[PDB]
Amino acid sequence: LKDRAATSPALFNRCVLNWFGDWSTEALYQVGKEFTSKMDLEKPNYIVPDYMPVVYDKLPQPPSHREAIVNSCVFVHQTLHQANARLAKRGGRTMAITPRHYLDFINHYANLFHEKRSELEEQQMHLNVGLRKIKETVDQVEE
Amino acid sequence: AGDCLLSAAFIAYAGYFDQQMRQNLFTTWSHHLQQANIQFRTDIARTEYLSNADERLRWQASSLPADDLCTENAIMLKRFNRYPLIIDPSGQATEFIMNEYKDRKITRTSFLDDAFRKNLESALRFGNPLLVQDVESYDPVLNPVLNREVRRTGGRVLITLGDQDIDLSPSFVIFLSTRDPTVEFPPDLCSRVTFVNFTVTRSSLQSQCLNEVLKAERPDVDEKRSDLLKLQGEFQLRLRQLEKSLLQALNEVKGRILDDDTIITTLENLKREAAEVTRKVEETDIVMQEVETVSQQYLPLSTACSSIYFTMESLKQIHFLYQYSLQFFLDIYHNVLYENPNLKGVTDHTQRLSIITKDLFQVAFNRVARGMLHQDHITFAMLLARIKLKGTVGEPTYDAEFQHFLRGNEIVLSAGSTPRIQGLTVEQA
Amino acid sequence: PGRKPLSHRFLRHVPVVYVDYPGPASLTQIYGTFNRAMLRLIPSLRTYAEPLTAAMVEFYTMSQERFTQDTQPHYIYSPREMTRWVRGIFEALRPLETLPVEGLIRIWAHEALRLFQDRLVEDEERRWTDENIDTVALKHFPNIDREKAMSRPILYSNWLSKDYIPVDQEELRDYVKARLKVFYEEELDVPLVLFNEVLDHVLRIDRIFRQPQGHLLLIGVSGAGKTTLSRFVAWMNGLSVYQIKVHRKYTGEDFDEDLRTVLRRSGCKNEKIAFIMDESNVLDSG
Ligand SMILES: Nc1ncnc2c1ncn2[C@@H]1O[C@H](COP(=O)(O)OP(=O)(O)O)[C@@H](O)[C@H]1O
């Protein structure tokens, strides 16, 4: 921006600059909560012994493990930000991490979750089919 | 749930960081998940959860190094949403991806080529992979391609590549790569690609050397480590294969009773392999308890190897002629491992490690110093001596003494500098 | 930066006059007249023209003293900000009558946030601005109701009503979802979640698009949604978004032809154009 202004003074004359901050923890939590909705993260049995929020404001009550999943996703984004900061402080050549990284992470999570649930369900139904076949073989043996 | 969470967080976010930073990220995420009781299974292997046996095997067939970093890079390369941008100072990744895509006729093109647009439009229509190198001069016409902003509202899927519109073939995958180990990128390009980084690092050398010495010395721990990995699914995969073979035999024989051995053999084999898998799972406590001991036994050698190689790499600063590649150090290491004249007779492991470490130091000094002026032999020799001194455990590191020896005589002070005895001078005082 | 000192050979022939920023007394005399002329639509609030100008000048000087150009290169505070403040308040009182003092100072605070806070970079700067706008409001208006600020999301929009009435967070969010349904039907089936910052940015870009000379400098990390929000609010105001398709062989005369085309569309056929560019779109200083 320092030399962008020098090249074109009209950038601070006719253009009202609007600064977009990086997506806040609230924004990341909302994106994660909305996008991880087709996913079935509802586990009836779940216990929370500790207190580790990142959003800090909405639904701090004992979650349904879905709030916990989204909280962990936002923590992953924050942790990568701290990793970049520490890498820059103790050296150099760090790389900017954007909200598009968060969107790609959520898409990867959704797709991988779908694949790794579908494969287990199909192998379970194959196992049930095999059990039925073995029962049919037992019937033949009894005959 | 949490297991796929960690895997996807690794795939989408990490990839530009080195092995040490990737592992630190993964262990921090795992600690956070376990502390919040998001149930994820421990002793995870990212590589075999995100890949199966045949994919890894075909990867190794198509020129992939056995290092875990290369396997994780290949994992990031098979499954991705943002088209990968390859960071490899050498060329194993580029030839790897050329091999992985022969059957789909991957075209090789570069941004510096004037026919880049011609080679890209034809590739995108024909639906074949296109790999573009030299991303330093990234061409901004790829922004619609990297954004995947193709308008599906129209009857046919048309992308507005430039002024004119081109239909996007579903099989079009673009690949970006560079020849430079480390360079800054504009954030707009950064947000549109999945950085996959093949650049080698001290931790990468440590892992490679530890794997190589474990394969060479004590093959038994290496084979049982491989078995530990195979305990994650692909043994279960072969279990399912035998299950479906049994199912096919069941209606192949139609429940024959006169000749029952045809199915009895399969049932006995299934029982034996189930017992074997149960024994392996129940030994998962005994294993990784002596495996960790063996790995820590061979850790000083690996850290010495990494330190030696990176001292060789930094030898550029001493003199322009001191130019050594990673392959030269790999040749040195393979020489000290698989053709030592000193390892023909000795078979005990604790002595074998001492011989390997000593001769590795010696061969590194010999090969490097043979191409050095006869005023730097002492410099390299005593840098190697310092590396060995940090390697050994019988005596302290003497960090303060080395720091003084190097630069502590530059401390400025003028108190008590007057010589006291007649047998002394001002500089000596 | 960017100002090259002039040569003495030319400099001797040209005398130079130093025009500095007007002082607090000069600023008060300058904009008190503007406030008095503006408040003629509401005879009920003539007595509040003096404290309004006092608060405007005092807040402007306070934000001038700190948060200068040393921290960021775009922290330029000039009487142009005061002029835009007066113009915004006046435009927010054109169709509107019988406004209480609370509504007037609400409009004042909204304009101050739009012209003083949306430019700041750090969250600390933003909360400093919020705290001190509240404190100047209470110092120059000690006898007002909490109708002045209510929830910190001070929002003004002309979508729900004909006039530029202030709107609530939830109603605006529901309206924006309703319009986003049709927007998705038109194009960009990708979902956009509406959190508070998205609504704030959409309102800011809309109020910029309202004025004839509305030009934007949307500065933020990639993927934050600047382009998507720009096109969304451009469609929501019926502006045709136009983009430059930039490549390596994209030369200067290509840019000249694109400028010719966009100016033909803007002037001829009376077509409103939301012509947008990014940093990757610029390859030449021309
Ligand atoms: N509020 C939001 N909710 C969900 N996704 C968003 C939001 N804002 C932006 N995006 C995503 O960002 C992508 C494009 O970002 P873009 O507008 O190019 O950001 P920038 O212009 O700052 O680079 C879109 O695919 C869109 O899905």
List the beta bridge partners of residue B110. B133
Q: How far apart are CA B98 and CA B131, in angstroms?
A: 8
Q: How far apart are CA C48 and CA C101, in angstroms?
A: 8
Q: How far apart are CA B332 and CA B382, in angstroms?
A: 19
Experimental technique of record: cryo-EM
B278 CB-side CA count, 13 A: 6
Which tokens belong to C236? Answer: 């929501």
* Three-class SS state of B188: helix
Interface of C with A in 108-167 (CB under 8 A): 118-121, 123
What's the one-letter identity of residue C225? G
Backbone angles phi, psi at C33, to 5 degrees: -60, -45
Element (H, E) at B242: helix B234-253
Planar angle of CA C171, C163, C193, nearest 5 degrees: 30
Which tokens belong to C110? Answer: 């909204």
Interacting residues of C151 by C-beta distance below 8 A, sequence separation 6+: C169
Angstrom CA distances, B150 to A21, A27, B145, B169, B288, stand at 28, 27, 8, 11, 50
CB-CB contact of B173 with B83 (8 Å):
yes
Which tokens belong to B379? Answer: 């410099």
Angstrom CA distances, B97 to B79, B319, C141, stand at 13, 36, 70
> In chain A, what's the furthest Cα-to-Cα distance?
95
Interacting residues of C111 by C-beta distance below 8 A, sequence separation 6+: C84, C85, C88, C89, C92
C225 is in an annotated binding site: yes
Residues C193, A103: C-beta atoms closer than 8 Å: no
What residue has token string 């439009």?
A: B121
Interface of C with A in 226-265 (CB under 8 A): 226
One-letter-per-residue 3-state SS of chain C: CCCCCCCHHHHCCCCCCCCCCCCHHHHHHHHHHHHHHHHHHCHHHHHHHHHHHHHHHHHHHHHHHCCCCCCCCCCCCCHHHHHHHHHHHHHCCCCCCCCCHHHHHHHHHHHHHHHHCCCCCCHHHHHHHHHHHHHHHHHHCCCCCHHHCCCCCCCECCCCCCCCCECCHHHHHHHHHHHHHHHHHHCCCCCCCCCHHHHHHHHHHHHHHHCCCCEEEEEECCCCCHHHHHHHHHHHCCCEEEECCCCCCCCHHHHHHHHHHHHHHHHHHHCCEEEECCCCCCCCCC
Long-range contact set of residues C149-156: C-beta below 8 Å, sequence gap at least 24: C149/C106, C149/C109, C153/C196, C153/C200, C154/C106, C154/C109, C154/C110, C154/C113, C155/C110, C155/C199, C155/C200, C155/C203, C156/C92, C156/C107, C156/C110, C156/C203, C156/C207
Q: How far apart are CA C183 and CA C203, in angstroms?
A: 17
Check residue B351 and give left, alpha or beta (phi > 0: left; psi -120 to 50: alpha): alpha
CB atoms within 10 A of CB B98: 17
Element (H, E) at B97: helix B92-100
How would you classify the pairing of strands B158-159 and B166-167? antiparallel
Q: How far is C46 from chain A (nearest CA, A)?
A: 31
Ligand 1 neighbourhood includes C224 CB (under 6 angstroms): yes
Interacting residues of C217 by C-beta distance below 8 A, sequence separation 6+: A11, A12, A15, A16, A17, A18
CB-CB contact of B199 with A95 (8 Å):
no
Q: How far is C222 from chain B (nearest CA, A)?
A: 6
C149 is in an annotated binding site: no
Q: How far apart are CA B196 and CA B83, in angstroms?
A: 10
> Is residue B132 classed exposed, middle or buried when 0-12, 13-18 and 19+ CB atoms within 10 A define those classes?
buried
Cα C113 off chain centre by = 9
What residue has token string 């609230």?
A: A26
CB-CB contact of B127 with B155 (8 Å):
no
* Three-class SS state of A139: helix
* Three-class SS state of B132: strand
CB-CB contact of B144 with B150 (8 Å):
yes
Residue closest to B210 by CA, chosen among B56, B48, B19: B19
Backbone angles phi, psi at A19, to 5 degrees: -85, 120
Q: Does A1 touch chain B (CB under 8 A)?
A: no
Q: What is the resolution of this structure in A?
A: 2.8
CB-CB contact of B311 with B383 (8 Å):
yes
Interacting residues of B236 by C-beta distance below 8 A, sequence separation 6+: B277
Ligand 1 neighbourhood includes C88 CB (under 6 angstroms): no
Q: How far apart are CA B176 and CA B87, in angstroms?
A: 9
Element (H, E) at B194: strand B194-197
What's the one-letter identity of residue B418? T
Ligand 1 neighbourhood includes C201 CB (under 6 angstroms): no
CB-CB contact of A18 with C224 (8 Å):
no
Q: How far apart are CA B11 and CA B33, in angstroms?
A: 17
Q: How far apart are CA B175 and CA B78, in angstroms?
A: 12
* Three-class SS state of B197: strand
List the beta bridge partners of residue A20. C220
Residues of chain C whose beta carbon is less than 8 angstroms from a beta carbon of chain B are: 187, 189, 221-223, 245-248, 250, 278-281, 283
Which tokens belong to B101? Answer: 């895509």
List the beta bridge partners of residue B132. B109, B176
> Is residue B336 classed exposed, middle or buried when 0-12, 13-18 and 19+ CB atoms within 10 A define those classes?
buried
What's the one-letter identity of residue B356? I
Picking from A18, A30, A100, the nearest residue to C218 by CB comes out as A18
Test site for ligand 1: of C222, C228, C243, most ligand atoms within 8 A of the Cβ: C228
Q: What is the distance in A from the centroid of ligand 1 to the CA of B190? A: 15
Residue closest to B142 by CA, chosen among B98, B176, B113: B176
> Is residue A108 classed exposed, middle or buried when 0-12, 13-18 and 19+ CB atoms within 10 A define those classes?
buried
How would you classify the pairing of strands A15-20 and C215-220? parallel
**Burial per residue of C2-31, b for 16 or more beta-carbon CB atoms within 10 angstroms, e otherwise:** eeeeeeeeeeeeeeeeeeeebeeeebbebb
CB-CB contact of B187 with C223 (8 Å):
no
Q: Going along B60-173, which residue ranges are E strands?
A: 84-87, 107-110, 130-133, 158-159, 166-167
Picking from C217, C220, C223, the nearest residue to A21 by CB comes out as C220
Residues A20, C73: C-beta atoms closer than 8 Å: no
A88 CB-side CA count, 13 A: 9
* Three-class SS state of B176: strand
CB-CB contact of C274 with C231 (8 Å):
yes
DSSP character for B83? P
Ligand 1 neighbourhood includes C232 CB (under 6 angstroms): no
Ligand 1 neighbourhood includes C73 CB (under 6 angstroms): no
